[model samples]
Target chain A: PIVQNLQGQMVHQCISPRTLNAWVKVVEEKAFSPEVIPMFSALSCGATPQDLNTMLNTVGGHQAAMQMLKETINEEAAEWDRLHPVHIAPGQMREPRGSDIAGTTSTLQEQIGWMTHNPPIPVGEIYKRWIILGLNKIVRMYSPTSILDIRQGPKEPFRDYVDRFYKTLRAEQTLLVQNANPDCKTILKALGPGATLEEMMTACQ
Target chain B: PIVQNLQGQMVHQCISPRTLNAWVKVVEEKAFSPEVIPMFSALSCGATPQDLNTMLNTVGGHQAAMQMLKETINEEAAEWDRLHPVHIAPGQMREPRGSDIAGTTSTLQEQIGWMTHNPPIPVGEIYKRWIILGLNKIVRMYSPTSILDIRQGPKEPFRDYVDRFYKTLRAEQTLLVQNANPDCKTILKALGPGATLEEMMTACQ
Candidate 1:
């Protein structure tokens, strides 16, 4: 990509030095706050041959920019992971069967059975969390697949699904809210005359 | 209320012996269905005077029975409106202030304005049909009160209030396919590319 400077100058042949300088300035300005600008300037001036060699070895020269970009990407990935955690069971890496269709089908069925029978968490809890995670993913994916699937298939008796899901979610939400606030009487009173789960959660937060 | 046929005993209180004899034989066996019982036997000894009067008075009374009861009521109210047909509006003579206030407050400004400006049916057509029938009196009386006030009060900004109200309701929902018949591709393809309003409505319906 041809990089241009603020003044439209071509400072270098292989890579535009002016553009690189501008990028560096931007990183200094944004990555580190204005308070740390003096520190970044000092570091720039003291960049000797040994310091250059150290940076080249540790940061991989031109790849240093790529490394920083990767780190930023990883930070986003970590946040997503925090919001949605994966559940991998034991024997997930078992070797696949080459022939014997029955044996392969049995193994697959057994795995499903194991997950159903001995879930890492309660089935209701797992489903509740999965629905929340699934909803978030659907919004992020911005595709019709998930929404369409909901409208199709088991179509699963709307009343039952909403009742169970809301119950689980409300319980968890109430607990979170109660833990956050203790002295709020208004929150307690609003839940009901005796303080309901929904009112408590709303008042607490 | 007077109880007739008390203790399963037929006490023909207000009925003449002749009428009783005629009814007893006629209503002896309840012929419920056409296939179960022959139609000739059912209508053999026609309904008695009491039976005819009862049937005529009931909402879904037998034709012969209803005719007798209707004739009696008609005779009583005959002179009341014998000269001309009696006309009555269900909402007539009621206080109009409540409805007037409600009309002014409940009128949706945009919807009312749109209807008034467009005027789907011609005034001549409306007047010929609606005004001649007395409906125009009610419509005309309510029209002025239907004009909605779009003005915002002191504490509320007009633009912000309108934006919030309009955006919340007017947010366009994406088209959704409720029924996913696999062979629907032919119909979908015939709709051409990009969703037309008609196609969206059809898909939703």
Candidate 2:
């Protein structure tokens, strides 16, 4: 162990700032290397992984940087999702709702409020959720998360989540209608007496 | 003036069956005239007033079908607006709540709930409010109503409504934050300890 004095104390330092900086510089250069330049260029031009990498000759710094970049991207994507929660329609793939408002419901508000008021969750956990949820699909498809997520959780894949979310939304809408319009029977009975769409037109004149 | 008995009493209409059929044929021919065809075509295609008039003239039903089509389309559009009230957003306009929860504020919720449950005011009046507020921009742009009166309403242009709505929403959101966060003062005072966005990101991470 290399003994060092830090802030008036004797301590063993594993790595110096200069060493860490040197490592970072090496990684950065490798990431920008000619072979990797195309990968970076392709990434800039919105290339998928399949297009970028036909073969993987693992250089330590490049591998580390690539991992770092992926995590950074995932975290950024999560932030975007948090800021701009996607809206979904009801009953497109699932159960139909009886009312309209149910289709636009989301837990985003509650989550935002929680985040704003409390300390943020760990970044690693955030990345984990983003990966597990296949939130990358959102960036690719530019579709609403609620529409895409049918079963919302770690286990459910992207397609399943989408279906489940839509289904759940429709079910919620139906519940909302039932709760709001309890006198559906009476309303239906009275419907014949109300102005018809055609008659209403004649009266508008 | 000749006082006809037909004015007060139902006329006992009697005609030879062949003659009645001939009259019906004439009426049908008049109803489906070449002049009427272009008017119908223009209406179906959502033609502008000038286009509609041109089409009507081309079909030889200029005056009669033009007037009829205008009245019919307006009535239909108004009825559609009434049944399906449109929500309008002013350009680059954010809601008062700092978020888009349509009826989250107490006052807004009360007003909207009253309108939805009671519907005492004429649908036209409610629609006019939406149009004046600028929320109707989206609906009007997409709807058949785009054919006529696409200009902003003079008294309550959408910008005015959006401004007022935002002011109210912001006040409500602030009030809510104050009510919910007891340590808000302490948190505000501790602001210089670190960058809010950075801290937020760290905490989230």
Candidate 3:
């Protein structure tokens, strides 16, 4: 994104060499917090390794930067562990079942189980793993054999049916049948028998 | 407020003749509804009599414009009456008391009574009358004889006390006493006896 600075000039903003240089200048001159230095490293999107190395070396060099990043990460992990504790017995691993670990499911049974990390994992890695686990659980629970099996009900409105169909699709993660497109035929059924017959006639004509 | 158009030109917006002329041009070229024409008339801020007359005459002469305005007003009034009916007996008038007519008051009994117009009045007039009635009721309910009397309580914080004092002033509508300034002395009392005595010593010094 382009933002106008106090000089009234439009500056292209992103994690790049020019921006990193500007950030380093600001950090070097001011009594900046070591806490926020790690945030810049985490938010590197378009920056290359050389650009990041250049920034770190300019501020605190490789040694100080490494220590700073390590301290910040440890502090954050400690806080995360304190707040969001994984309540599990010492050697008990909860087996994966067709339910969420949140213990707030309606079908099958409740699952209020979580795995304790042997050695503390990074917050990002932990979140990513949990999300994947949850998605897999949802997919297994809502396993539809075919797209045709997830049809719109008689009393369901078209808009409501579309929402339910989309939700089912998301849960299943993939269309099951050979004919991948459900919308091509399912919409006709969704509209009602009379509308479907009329549509067929129009198509035939 | 100034808004940028698709042409990248800044346009100073408000109800004005330049905009009215543009509106009139659009109305003339298109099959526009008479319902929306009255809205422009109602929103007139910087428009002159001549400009408005020109707009009305161009679209439909003075007679058509007058009828359009009358029909719109009547329709709105009918809808308002249907939605917000004043449930009063034919001859019984509810006397004004110190409370809102919303039937959701915490002080001095709830006021659920509203006046019905003998002949149907304009919606604007009805709304203005009700607002004034509500304000007067609120004022009577929270009448404070003196600003000093509305001093902060022993347990009350400065911010909370300030809020309460201001509310009292609004409810009373006018500050009562020869020395109308309440913050000069009342705030000292509000803070604490110790603070007040200490302030007095500072004043003496």
Candidate 4:
């Protein structure tokens, strides 16, 4: 048993001393919380079957880890549901709360702290949750109808329409949501494949 | 799951997004291995379980390292064997300290290094060999004397004798290096002849 972690698994000396020395630094520096830097725990050094079983029970024994993950989701939904909410109308706004210190619902440090201090969900879900929560918030704040029935306000070149559209979508940016949303771009797409918004307005005349 | 490592478990959202972005490239493009790159291999980026991907994901990923053992002596690991025509030896009649690195047939990297590069033995054997090889190195550097004989040395000053004896005994390190710093008393007890840290300290008093 080279070292037993919080999960109670012994580390077997399997590989080179040089590499093991580095890992030892990781463990020593990590101070035995594999959750912070999981790579230390997951590799097979020379673990016994029991050691394997014990570690599996700790990390994958998701019941303890599960509770924290579930709370994170609700906390996340609450944050966006409060902050950059999708439920608000295009022209609507809400007073920022103390929690919205940066106008961003959750900071990375907070997320990492929540992660290292608590438990985590499935790996992909780490990235998945942020997108889901943001989408839910954006879609809730204001959603564009597929139909493009807005009046073409004159003299303003409809600065308001474009501004609102970009502002709402900019809340979350990704290729997945960038082009295919129910926005002015969607109206442009309806005009004709690859047709610009200018082309649509000109054709309207 | 990206990779299941030594812990015999899968990681769940182990690291942050920025790091994950980098690791994605590691798994998909750097297929050579994350194990060779310890940091990448040790993450919780993937959610797949061990049983789920027993064949597909090994501890370091892309490699399952067991169902094998090295029960016999690593004849090659023996310093005498490795250094026989031995490019190096500590018999450095003149350079005990200087040739410590230079005279060794198998460097720590070569010995413990061999452990990491090669497949592992049993958890029991891993410890056995570490203590074994570790002992081999120490004995080669300098021979050991019983606690009975440790009472006497060159200057034989009581204080120097005590310090050197403890240091030399401590130098053997220990077979039980499981807990790095527990209680010095426990260590003294294990050091043989049943001395306690308190007892040793009082002797100074």
- In the order shown, what is each candidate's alpha-carbon RMSD? 39.2, 35.3, 32.1, 26.4
Give the candidate order by descending lDDT: 3, 4, 2, 1
How displaced is residue A140 in candidate 3, in Å?
Answer: 28
Candidate 2 lDDT by residue in tens digits, B47-131: 2222222333344322453355444445544555466553424432222220111221223333322333332222223322222
Candidate 2: stretches off by over 4 Å: A1-39, A42-46, A49-61, A87-205, B1-205
Better of 2 and 3 by TM-score: 3
Residue A160 lDDT in model 4? 53
Return the TM-scores of chain A for each candidate in numbered order: 0.16, 0.21, 0.23, 0.22
Better model by lDDT, 1 or 3?
Answer: 3
Highest-scoring model, lDDT: 3
lDDT per residue for candidate 1 within B63-142, as digits (tens), equals 22222223333333343235434332563322212111112222222212222233321211221221122222212221
**Compared with the true structure, what per-residue lDDT tens digits does model 3 show for residues B44-124?**
312222233334445553354345543443444455556665434565544332122211121121111122233312222
| Residue B31 accuracy (lDDT) in model 1 | 19
Model 2 sits at a Cα RMSD from the real structure of: 35.3
Worst 10 residues of 3 chain B by lDDT: B103-112
TM-score of 2: 0.14
Model 1 CA deviation exceeding 4 Å by range: A1-178, A183-186, A189-197, A202-205, B1-161, B168-205
Q: For this target, which candidate reaches the highest TM-score against the unseen true structure?
A: 4
Off by over 4 Å in 4: A1-205, B1-131, B134-141, B144-160, B170-197
| DockQ result, candidate 1 | 0.01
Write down the lDDT that model 3 would get: 0.36
The better candidate by TM-score, 1 or 3, is: 3
